[PDB]
Amino acid sequence: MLDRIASIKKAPDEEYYVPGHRTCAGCGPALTYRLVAKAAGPNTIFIGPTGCMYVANTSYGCGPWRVPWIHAQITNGGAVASGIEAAYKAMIRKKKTDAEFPNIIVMAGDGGAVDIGLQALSAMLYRGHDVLFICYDNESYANTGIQTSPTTPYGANTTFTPPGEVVPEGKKLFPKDNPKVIAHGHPELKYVATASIGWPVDLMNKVRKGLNQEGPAYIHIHAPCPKGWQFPADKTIEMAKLAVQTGMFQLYEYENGEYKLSVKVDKRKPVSEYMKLQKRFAHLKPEHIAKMQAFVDARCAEVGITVPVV
Amino acid sequence: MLDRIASIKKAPDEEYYVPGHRTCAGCGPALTYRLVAKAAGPNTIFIGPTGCMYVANTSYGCGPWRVPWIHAQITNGGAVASGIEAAYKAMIRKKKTDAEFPNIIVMAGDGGAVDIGLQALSAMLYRGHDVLFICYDNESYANTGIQTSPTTPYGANTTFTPPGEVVPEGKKLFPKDNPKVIAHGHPELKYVATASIGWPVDLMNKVRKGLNQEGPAYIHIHAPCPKGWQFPADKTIEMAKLAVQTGMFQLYEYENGEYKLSVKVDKRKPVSEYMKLQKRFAHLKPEHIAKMQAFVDARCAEVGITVPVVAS
Amino acid sequence: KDLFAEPNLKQITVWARGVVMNKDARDIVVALTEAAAKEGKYVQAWENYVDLPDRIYVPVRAYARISSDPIESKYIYENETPDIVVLVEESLIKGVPILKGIRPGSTLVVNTKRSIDTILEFLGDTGNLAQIVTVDANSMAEGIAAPIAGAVVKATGIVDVENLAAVVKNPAAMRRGYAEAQVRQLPPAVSATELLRQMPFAGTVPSPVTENEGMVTGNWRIQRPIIDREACTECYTCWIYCPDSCITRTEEGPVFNMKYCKGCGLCTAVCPSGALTNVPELDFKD
Amino acid sequence: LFAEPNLKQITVWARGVVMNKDARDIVVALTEAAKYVQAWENYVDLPDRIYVPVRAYARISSDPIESKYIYENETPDIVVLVEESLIKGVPILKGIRPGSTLVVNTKRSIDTILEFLGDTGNLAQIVTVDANSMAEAVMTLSGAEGATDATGIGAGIAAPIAGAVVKATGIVDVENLAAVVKNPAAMRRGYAEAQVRQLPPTELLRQMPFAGTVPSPVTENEGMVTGNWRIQRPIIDREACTECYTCWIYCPDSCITRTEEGPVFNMKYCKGCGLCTAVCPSGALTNVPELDFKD
Amino acid sequence: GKVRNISGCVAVAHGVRLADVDVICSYPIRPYTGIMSELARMVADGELDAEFVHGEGEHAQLSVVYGASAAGARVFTGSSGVGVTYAMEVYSPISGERLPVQMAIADRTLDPPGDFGEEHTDAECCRDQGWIQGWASTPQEALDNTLIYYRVGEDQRVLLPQYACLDGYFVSHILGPVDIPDEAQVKEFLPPYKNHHVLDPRKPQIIGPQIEPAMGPPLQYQRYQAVKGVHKVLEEACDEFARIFGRKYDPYLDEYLTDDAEVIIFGQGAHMETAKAVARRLRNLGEKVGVARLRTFRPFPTEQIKERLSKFKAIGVLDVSANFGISCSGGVLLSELRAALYDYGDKVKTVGFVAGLGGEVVTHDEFYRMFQKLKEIAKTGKVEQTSYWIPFEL
Amino acid sequence: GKVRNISGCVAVAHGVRLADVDVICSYPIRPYTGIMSELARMVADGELDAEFVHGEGEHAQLSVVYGASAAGARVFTGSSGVGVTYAMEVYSPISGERLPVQMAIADRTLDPPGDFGEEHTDAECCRDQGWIQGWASTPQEALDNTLIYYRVGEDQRVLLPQYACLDGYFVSHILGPVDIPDEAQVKEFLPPYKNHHVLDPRKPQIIGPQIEPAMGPPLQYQRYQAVKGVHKVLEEACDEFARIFGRKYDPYLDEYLTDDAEVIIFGQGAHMETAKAVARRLRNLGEKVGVARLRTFRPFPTEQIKERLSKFKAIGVLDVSANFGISCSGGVLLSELRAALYDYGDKVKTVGFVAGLGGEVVTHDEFYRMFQKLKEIAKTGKVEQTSYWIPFEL
Numbered sequence A: 001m002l003d004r005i006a007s008i009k010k011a012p013d014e015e016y017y018v019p020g021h022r023t024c025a026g027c028g029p030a031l032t033y034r035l036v037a038k039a040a041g042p043n044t045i046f047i048g049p050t051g052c053m054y055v056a057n058t059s060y061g062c063g064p065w066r067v068p069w070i071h072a073q074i075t076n077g078g079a080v081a082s083g084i085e086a087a088y089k090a091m092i093r094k095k096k097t098d099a100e101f102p103n104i105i106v107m108a109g110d111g112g113a114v115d116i117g118l119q120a121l122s123a124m125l126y127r128g129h130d131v132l133f134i135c136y137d138n139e140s141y142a143n144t145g146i147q148t149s150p151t152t153p154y155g156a157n158t159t160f161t162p163p164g165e166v167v168p169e170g171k172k173l174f175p176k177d178n179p180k181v182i183a184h185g186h187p188e189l190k191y192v193a194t195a196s197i198g199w200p201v202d203l204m205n206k207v208r209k210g211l212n213q214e215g216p217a218y219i220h221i222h223a224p225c226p227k228g229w230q231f232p233a234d235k236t237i238e239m240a241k242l243a244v245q246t247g248m249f250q251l252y253e254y255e256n257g258e259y260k261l262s263v264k265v266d267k268r269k270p271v272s273e274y275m276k277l278q279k280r281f282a283h284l285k286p287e288h289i290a291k292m293q294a295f296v297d298a299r300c301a302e303v304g305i306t307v308p309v310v
Numbered sequence B: 001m002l003d004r005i006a007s008i009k010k011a012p013d014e015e016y017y018v019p020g021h022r023t024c025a026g027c028g029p030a031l032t033y034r035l036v037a038k039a040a041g042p043n044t045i046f047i048g049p050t051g052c053m054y055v056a057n058t059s060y061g062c063g064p065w066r067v068p069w070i071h072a073q074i075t076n077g078g079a080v081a082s083g084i085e086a087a088y089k090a091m092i093r094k095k096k097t098d099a100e101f102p103n104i105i106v107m108a109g110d111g112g113a114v115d116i117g118l119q120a121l122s123a124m125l126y127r128g129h130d131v132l133f134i135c136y137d138n139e140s141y142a143n144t145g146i147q148t149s150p151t152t153p154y155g156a157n158t159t160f161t162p163p164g165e166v167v168p169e170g171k172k173l174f175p176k177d178n179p180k181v182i183a184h185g186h187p188e189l190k191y192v193a194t195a196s197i198g199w200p201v202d203l204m205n206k207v208r209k210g211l212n213q214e215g216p217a218y219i220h221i222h223a224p225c226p227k228g229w230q231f232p233a234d235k236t237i238e239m240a241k242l243a244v245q246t247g248m249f250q251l252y253e254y255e256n257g258e259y260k261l262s263v264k265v266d267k268r269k270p271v272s273e274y275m276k277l278q279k280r281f282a283h284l285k286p287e288h289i290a291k292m293q294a295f296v297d298a299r300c301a302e303v304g305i306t307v308p309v310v311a312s
Numbered sequence C: 001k002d003l004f005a006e007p008n009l010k011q012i013t014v015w016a017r018g019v020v021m022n023k024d025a026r027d028i029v030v031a032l033t034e035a036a037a038k039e040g041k042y043v044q045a046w047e048n049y050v051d052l053p054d055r056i057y058v059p060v061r062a063y064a065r066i067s068s069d070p071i072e073s074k075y076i077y078e079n080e081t082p083d084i085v086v087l088v089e090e091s092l093i094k095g096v097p098i099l100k101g102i103r104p105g106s107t108l109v110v111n112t113k114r115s116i117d118t119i120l121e122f123l124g125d126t127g128n129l130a131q132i133v134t135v136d137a138n139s140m141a142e143g144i145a146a147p148i149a150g151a152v153v154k155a156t157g158i159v160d161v162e163n164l165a166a167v168v169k170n171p172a173a174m175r176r177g178y179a180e181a182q183v184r185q186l187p188p189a190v191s192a193t194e195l196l197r198q199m200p201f202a203g204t205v206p207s208p209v210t211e212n213e214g215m216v217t218g219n220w221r222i223q224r225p226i227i228d229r230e231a232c233t234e235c236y237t238c239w240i241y242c243p244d245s246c247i248t249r250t251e252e253g254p255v256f257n258m259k260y261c262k263g264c265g266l267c268t269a270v271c272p273s274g275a276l277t278n279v280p281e282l283d284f285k286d
Numbered sequence D: 001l002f003a004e005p006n007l008k009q010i011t012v013w014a015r016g017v018v019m020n021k022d023a024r025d026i027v028v029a030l031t032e033a034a035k036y037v038q039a040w041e042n043y044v045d046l047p048d049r050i051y052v053p054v055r056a057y058a059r060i061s062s063d064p065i066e067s068k069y070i071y072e073n074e075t076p077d078i079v080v081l082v083e084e085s086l087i088k089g090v091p092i093l094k095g096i097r098p099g100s101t102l103v104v105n106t107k108r109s110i111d112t113i114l115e116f117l118g119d120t121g122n123l124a125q126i127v128t129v130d131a132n133s134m135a136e137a138v139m140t141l142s143g144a145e146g147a148t149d150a151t152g153i154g155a156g157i158a159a160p161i162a163g164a165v166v167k168a169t170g171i172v173d174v175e176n177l178a179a180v181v182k183n184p185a186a187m188r189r190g191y192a193e194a195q196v197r198q199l200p201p202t203e204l205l206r207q208m209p210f211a212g213t214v215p216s217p218v219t220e221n222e223g224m225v226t227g228n229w230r231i232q233r234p235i236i237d238r239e240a241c242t243e244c245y246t247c248w249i250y251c252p253d254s255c256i257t258r259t260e261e262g263p264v265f266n267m268k269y270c271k272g273c274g275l276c277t278a279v280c281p282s283g284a285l286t287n288v289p290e291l292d293f294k295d
Numbered sequence E, F: 001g002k003v004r005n006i007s008g009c010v011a012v013a014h015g016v017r018l019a020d021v022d023v024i025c026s027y028p029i030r031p032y033t034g035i036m037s038e039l040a041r042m043v044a045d046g047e048l049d050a051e052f053v054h055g056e057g058e059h060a061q062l063s064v065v066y067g068a069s070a071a072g073a074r075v076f077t078g079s080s081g082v083g084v085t086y087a088m089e090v091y092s093p094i095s096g097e098r099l100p101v102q103m104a105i106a107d108r109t110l111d112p113p114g115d116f117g118e119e120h121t122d123a124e125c126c127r128d129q130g131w132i133q134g135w136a137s138t139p140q141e142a143l144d145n146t147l148i149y150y151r152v153g154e155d156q157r158v159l160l161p162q163y164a165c166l167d168g169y170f171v172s173h174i175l176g177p178v179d180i181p182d183e184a185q186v187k188e189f190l191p192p193y194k195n196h197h198v199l200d201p202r203k204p205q206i207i208g209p210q211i212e213p214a215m216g217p218p219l220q221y222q223r224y225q226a227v228k229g230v231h232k233v234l235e236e237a238c239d240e241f242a243r244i245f246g247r248k249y250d251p252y253l254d255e256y257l258t259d260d261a262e263v264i265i266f267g268q269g270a271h272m273e274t275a276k277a278v279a280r281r282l283r284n285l286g287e288k289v290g291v292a293r294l295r296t297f298r299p300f301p302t303e304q305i306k307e308r309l310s311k312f313k314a315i316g317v318l319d320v321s322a323n324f325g326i327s328c329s330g331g332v333l334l335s336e337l338r339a340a341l342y343d344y345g346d347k348v349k350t351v352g353f354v355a356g357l358g359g360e361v362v363t364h365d366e367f368y369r370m371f372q373k374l375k376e377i378a379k380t381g382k383v384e385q386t387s388y389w390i391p392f393e394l
C-alpha cells in the first residue's frame, strides 16, 4: 500500500524517470511522467501508446524509465494493459512466476485516451482489470505537429484547425469531457480523478490512491504544452495553475456518484486572462471569449463550482 | 418536424418496414425496427452495422426497408453515418443536389453500439452530426450464435459464458450502462433516451423527438431475444414489460442534466419474476439472484426510482 | 457426376423447425449414423450450415450420409439428392420443398396424427417418392427422436432394429414407432453465365414498396392466429406488436396477412380480450 | 563518381521551436532568390523540441541537382548559427569543406566565439550580425510538416541573418532576396551591418540489440544528453535558498538532487527551461546566458 | 493417445489445452467462434486453467495477447474474415517485438461476400507481417499444427508469432478422426515459453523504443534472418513430432502420387484432400496426374518447390481466394510458385485456377476439369490465359 | 499552369482542391499529415468548399468517406504506416460496394521500425483489396495522379477506389517544380462523380445486403471483370491528360534508356529517380544499362511487362519494402515480375534487391553496386541467390 505524501519535502527522493529524454524544454507531460513514476515506485510497468511521451522519451533507442516499459499502439493502450494484467494474474496463479503483482500504468495521450483509444479504454474498465489508466492531456496531437483533438479547447489554433475567413475561430468544436465519459456506466470502475502538474503532491496522491484500489482507476492529468499552446518554456507551471484558477481545468475526485473538489477556488479569473498568454487563442475575438466563458461556467457547474467570475 | 404520437389509435398506419425478413419468430429487434421505421417516415436513411438486423433482414439479396439502407461494419456505425451526414450537408450547400436533408438513423446492435462500435459512436457525438444513433439491445452477439457482450446481464448464460464449477454463474461481469457512458462529456449531444418495445408509442415518440433535434441523438432500445434469452416466441412483449417492472431496464429521458422517468412504476417486482422466465438464468442459485437484485436496486437509485420491491 | 458418383451412399434429409426443434432433427441423424457404424458402414452426421443462423420456426435441416464405402462428398454442405426425407414437425408438408431432388425408391417419414390421404393434399405431386410413413411420435415420447427413427427403419430397413435399439435413450418408444408406422407404397443446375447475370451491380437491390418477396415466411407457420370478431374490441394492441407487419387496420377490425405470418403468437398472447386463438396450420388449406 | 562541384551545401543550425521557423525562412529565401535549388528542413530533427539543436539545409547549383533525396548536407560549405550558444557542445564543424563561411547571429565579439570553437578546420570566413535588434523572432503553428506558411517568408530575423550570409559569399542578389522576404528593410541592415572577418589558412547490425529491446537505465539516460540544449542556465544564491525544494518537484528532467547543502543542479542534462527560476518562491535562482561559462 | 471423432474447432481447443495456454482473448465470428466457445467451456469446467478475456474486438484480441505474451505468458487467440483485417495494425508489432502469439484462423470471406463461407483471402493479407503461416486440411492436423507452431514459433532461435490456419466450415465443422495426444507426450514435445525480453519489475527492460533512423535496416534485417531460420527449426519439430506422437509430417509439401506424375495441382487447405480423391480415380484410369499440398505458406518454401516440383510438364495452381489485380490474374500461390520455378519457366508450364469463391465447394468435377486442362497444356506446351476463374471461365 | 516549388503534400492538396472534393476526413500521422493541414487551410481560407471531418482514427476515415461516397459525394482521405493497416477492414467493403474512394498514402514503415522513414510495405498490404494503386515518384506526379485516379476510378465502367501512393519524405516533403493546372483544365478532364447506386430517399436502394451463398462467386467475378477493365480506361486518361495538361504519362512503365539496354533495374517510387540519375552516368561510361519504373501497381500490368521487359539479359528488382516470408526472399515486385516474365525464365535473368529499409536513402553507391551485379549475372548467366538485402548482403 502506497502511503499518502504529506508535502514536497516529504516526497521520496528516488526517481524512476531519470534525466535524459528528447522532450521540449519545460515539457508539462514530462513532469507528469516524472511525478507519476515517482509516486508509483519500482514495482511498476508502464504502457506507452504512440505519442510524445513515447517518441520524445525514447529517441533514439533508449528511454528514461527505471522500471519496465513496453510500446503500445495509440489504438490499444488499455487493451495491451489488460493483457499484461491478465498474464501476471495467470502466471502467478499457475505458479509460473514468483513476481509480485506490479503497478500497471497506461500513459496515454489525450488522442489515445479520449479519441482513438477510448474503445480500448472503456472495455478495460468494463472487464475490471487492476490497471491504472492515466491520460496526460496537452489538448492536441502534439507529436504529429499539433493537430486538433477532442480535448482541444474551442477556438484553438492547430494545423488541422487554422483560423480563416470561413472558420474565424479555427476550431468550432467544444472539447470532449473524457473524465465524465468513463465515470458513468462502468460498475468495476472504483476511482476517477483529475490532476494538474501545478499541484504535484495532489497529483502523486491521486496516482497512489488509484493504485491502491482493487480495480481499474482513471486519472485525467492536465499537462500544458509550451510548443503546442505557444508560450515560453518557463511558464508551464503558471499555465497549469492558471488553468485551474480560471476554470479551464477542474480538479476533483468523482467517487460514489459524488464530486469532491481538490483545490479551493475562492475566486476564479476570467478565461481571457489565461487565453491571452497563449498564441493559440491569439486570433479569437471578444465574442469567442464570451462563448468560451459561458462554456466554462456550464463546465464548472457540473463539478460544483458555484462562485461567480471575478 | 415529426409530430408527437398521441396513442395507438392515433399512430400512423403507414409501414416502412414491410413483411418479409428472416428474423426469428417473435423477434424483439424486428419489432423495434418496425416501430423505428414507422416513426421515422419516408425521408430516412438507415445504417445497419453487422448483426441480426442486418443479416436476418437482408437474407438473401433483399430487404424490408422502403427507405434507403446501407451496410456498415460492426465497427463503424457512427463513422459511416457521419459520412452520410457530412455528404448531404455539402452536396446541398454546393447545389449538387435538390434532396432535402434526410433522417439519418443508425440501427446498431448492443455489440455495435457498446462494445466494438463505441468509439465511432462517441466521436460522432463529439462532431455533432445530425444523426440518430439507435441501439437495439438483445444483450448478446446474437447473429454469431448468442455470445456475451457488455450489455449481457450478470450471471447470464452464453456460449462464451457457460456455467461450470469454476464459474457457476457463467458471466461474472455486470453489464455496461452505455446510455450513461455517452450521456456525459459530449457538449453537442442534446437528447438521450432509453426505450422498450413494451411501450411502442413512447418508443416511437422518443425516436421522433431525437430526429427533431438539430444534432446527434442516442436512443437505447430494449428488445428481448426469444432465441438468445431462451423463452417462448410469444412472451417477448411480456418480457419487455417485466424487464421494466422489475428494474432490469429503466425508461427515461436524460436532458439538461436531469433524468425524466417515462413510465410510472408504483410498485417494482423482484428480479426473480423476470429471470425465471428465461433459461439463460436457469443455472443461478438464489444467492446469484441476490447480487442481481442488489445491482438492480442501485441501478434504479441513479435515475430516481425510489419505490420499494413488492414481496421481496 | 459420373466419375465421382457414390452408389453405396444413402442421403437423408431431416427437416425441422428452427431453434425449437433443431436438436430433434440432430438426434435422429446421430442415432441413425451410430447404428449404421455398428454394421461397419461409413457415416456422417451434421446440421445444415446454410440454415445458420437458425431462426425460430424457420424450416431448417439436418443431413445424414451412410455408405459402405469411404465418403468422398464430405465437403458438400447439403444433401442434394435425398433418399429419406424426415419431418420432425407435421406442418412442414405445407409450403416447404421437402421433395426436391428425391431419388427413386425414396421414403417420406412424417410425425402426425392425420391420415396419409390428407397429407397428400399438402404434398401435391409426390414425384419419384416410393413410400410414405406416418407416426405419432408425440404420444410415444410421452424424446420424439426414437419413435421417428424407428418408423424410418420400418420402411427403409437401412439399419437393424437391435442396432438402433442400442443407441437410443428410449428404445421402448422407438419400437412403437417401428410397429405403428403406417406405410403406403406409391408408384414410381443453372449455368454460371446465368448465375452471373442474376447478380446486380455490387449486389445493390431496389427497396420494396409493400412487401419483401425475397423472403416469404408464411411457411414458418406451425399455428396461425384466428380472430373472433364478436370478441374483438379493436384495441389494435395486436397490430402495434406484430414484429412482421402482418396486421392491417380495417373497418372490420384487424386483418391478418397469412402470406408472411410466422405464427409467433404474440398478437394472441398480448390480446386482453381473448379474441385470438392459436390454431394448428394443418387445419387450413390456404 | 557522383560529385557535384556546382553544388554548394549550406547547414543552418538553430534552436528548436523558438527559431525553427527562422532557420527555414533563411534557407527558403536564398533558394527562391537563385540556378537549381533545393530547400527543406531536417526531417531527422522532427518533431522539433524547445532549445534542441535543429537544422535547415540548402543546395544551390548551376547544374541539375542529383543529390536531392539525401536527408542531410554531409559536406557543408556554409554554416549558419542563429543562436550564439550553439558553438558549445554541438558538432557544427563536421565535414566542412574548404573555402567555407560561418555565419553567427550575435552581438558578442569574434574573439570570444573562437574560444569555444577551437580549430575551425577548413573554415575560411566568419560572419556576425545582430539581427536581434533589426528584426524580431517569429513562431507559428502553420507551415508545419510541409504545410505552407501563411505568415510568408523572411518575416522576422530570417532576412537580416540571410543578408549577412550574402555579404560574404554573394550567392544571390540582394534585390532577388528582397523580393522573397517580408522585410527587405531589415535585410538591408543585415546585408550592410554584417561584420566579416577572414580566417587564417554489418556493424550497425552488431549494434542492434534483440528486437531493439534495451535494458532500463538506473540513474540516467546517457542515450540522450540534453545539456547542450542550454541557451541559459539557472544559477543559485544559496544564502537566499530556503531549501523548500519547490524547484526540485517542478523539474521536468529530474536534474535537481536534494542534498544537505541544498538543491544541486545537473548541468549534464539541464535544458535550461527556466521553470525552476520561475517557480522559486525565494528568488534564489537567476537565468544567465550559457556563453558566460567555459565548462 | 485417445482417438476422437471431433471437428476442427474442438480439435484446436484440445491443442490449445495441451499447450497449457495461459491467456485467451475471444470475440465472435463464424466459423472460428466454436473454438472460443469450446475454450470457454473447457475453462469453465476446469479442464484448463487460463484467463479468458472478453475482447471488445479483434484489434483488441491481438492487442491483449500481445501484452500478455510480453509479460511472459503463453497466449492464444483467433478470428475470421473481416475480423482478420480489423486487427491488421497489431500484426506487425507482434512479430517485430518477437512475441510468439499464436492466432487460429478459420478462414471466412471478407465483406463482400460476407459472413457465410470461406476464402483464404483474409489470412493472405497478413503475408508480410512476419509470422509463421500454414493451412491444416484436416481436424487432426489442426491440433498438430497448434503444438508444432508453438514449438517452432516459441523456439528461442525463432521467437515469432504464428497463423494456425484452417479452412472455414470444411475443417472447422466437419468431423474427423483425431488422435488427441497425452499430456506427457506434449510435455515431452513442448517446453515452457521463455523469451529474451519480458516485462518484469525485478529485471526491468524497455521494450520497443523509437529507434535511430540509421538503425532501421539492421532491425529489419535482424527479423529477416529470424524468418529465414524458421524452416530449419520446423523440420526438427516434424521429426520430433513423429518420434513422440507417431505422426510423420512433411515440413513443406504434402505430395500424393507425384513421382510419375506428368501434371499436378498445387494448392493448400482441405480442398487438396478433394483433389487427391480426384487424382486417385484418374490414376486408376491410367492417367499420370498428381497433387502437391502446401503445408507451410510462410516462410515460403521457395527452393524446396524449385527442387521438388520442377520435374512436371504442367502445374495447375489452385487459389481459393480473391487477390484482385495481382499478376497473372490468379492468386498469391500462382505468383509465388512461378517465382519459385522461374528458372524452369520455359520447361515447367504453369496455369492458375481460381475456385472456391464465396465459400463454394471446389467440387470433384471442377478438379477433373482442371486436370484435363493440364493435359492440353502438357500436349501443346502452351498457355492461353495464365488463370481461369472457375466456373465462369473453365 | 503556374509553376511552383512545392512539396508532395501541397501538390496532393492542390489535386484535391482542383477535384472539388466535397467531403474530407482527416487524421494526423507522419509524414502525410501536411496534406490535411493544407486542405484545412484551403477550407479555412475559402480556397476550397468542402466538409472537413475530424476523424477519430484511420478506421473511421475510410468509414466516413465510405458512407459519404454512397451519398454521392466526391471524397478524399489518407494515411501512412500503421494508419494504413488500422483502416484495413474498410478497404474491401469500399471496393466491394464500388465506391471510388481515393486515399493518398505517403509511405511510412510499420511498427517496427517506427516513425522515421518510408517503406512501400504499408501500402503493399492493400494489394488484394481491389483498388487502383500506383506510386508517384515526383511532387508533380503526386498532383497528376490525384486527378487521374479520380477520373479512372469514378468511371462508370470502373467504379473502384484508388491508392494514390507517394514516397515518404522523398516525395511528400522534398520540394519540386510543379505546374499547377487551371480549373478549366481539370473541369474539362474531370466530370462530377456519379455512381449507379446512391443513398437517396426519393429513389431508395438497399446497399450491401446479405447475398445467397451461391451468389458468392458471381459477385466476386463481377468485381474481377471490373478490375480487368481498369487498364483500358487508364490509357484513355493518360492520353487525355496529355492533351489537356501537356504532360504525357505512360500508363504502366516509365522506362529510361531501355531501348538498347542489356540490363535494367525494375522498381517503383522516388528511389527510381536516383536510379535514373545513375543509369545515365554509367551510359556515359559506355555501359548499356536502363531503368523501368512501375507507375501502376494495381491492377498489375502483367502482359504489358511480358511484352516490354522480355528483351533484356538481366533485370534487377528493387523492393523498398519488407514483405517477410515471401517467395525468393525479396519483395512483392520481384515475385510479381518473375510471374509475368515466367515464360522467359530461362533467358531473362531476374534478381531482387531489398533496400531503403527503415526509410534509409537508396544511395547512388548502392544503385551502382546493383548495376555491377547485373552485369556480372549477364556475363555468367547465373544467379547465386534470388535476393540481396542491401547493404548487409550486397
Ligand SMILES: Cc1ncc(C[n+]2csc(CCOP(=O)(O)OP(=O)(O)O)c2C)c(N)n1
Binding pocket: B029, B050, B051, B052, B053, B073, B074, B075, B108, B109, B110, B111, B112, B113, B138, B140, B141, B142, B143, B144, B149, E028, E029, E030, E058, E082, E083, E086, E115, F089
Ligand atoms: C469487425 C467484425 N467482427 C466480427 C463480426 C462477426 N459478426 C457478425 S454478426 C455479429 C453479431 C453483432 O452483434 P450485435 O451488434 O449485438 O447485433 P445482433 O447480432 O445482436 O443483432 C458479429 C460479431 C463482423 N461482422 N465484423
Ligand code: SF4
Binding pocket: A022, A023, A024, A025, A026, A027, A028, A029, A030, A052, A056, A138, A142, A143, A224, A225, A226, A227, A228, D049, D050
Ligand atoms: S510537444 Fe508538448 S508534450 Fe510534446 S515534448 Fe514538446 S512540450 Fe512536451
Ligand code: SF4
Binding pocket: B022, B023, B024, B026, B027, B028, B029, B030, B052, B053, B056, B138, B142, B143, B224, B225, B226, B227, B228, C055, C056
Ligand atoms: S437472434 Fe434475437 S435478434 Fe436475432 S433474429 Fe433471433 S430473436 Fe431477433
Ligand code: SF4
Binding pocket: C227, C231, C232, C233, C234, C235, C236, C237, C238, C239, C253, C254, C267, C270, C271, C272, C273, C274, C275, C276
Ligand atoms: S388485440 Fe384482440 S381485441 Fe385488440 S384489436 Fe387485436 S383481436 Fe381485437
Ligand SMILES: [Mg+2]
Binding pocket: A109, A110, A111, A136, A137, A138, A139, A140, A141, A142, A149
Ligand atoms: Mg496530446
Ligand SMILES: [Mg+2]
Binding pocket: B051, B109, B110, B111, B136, B137, B138, B139, B140, B141, B142
Ligand atoms: Mg446484440
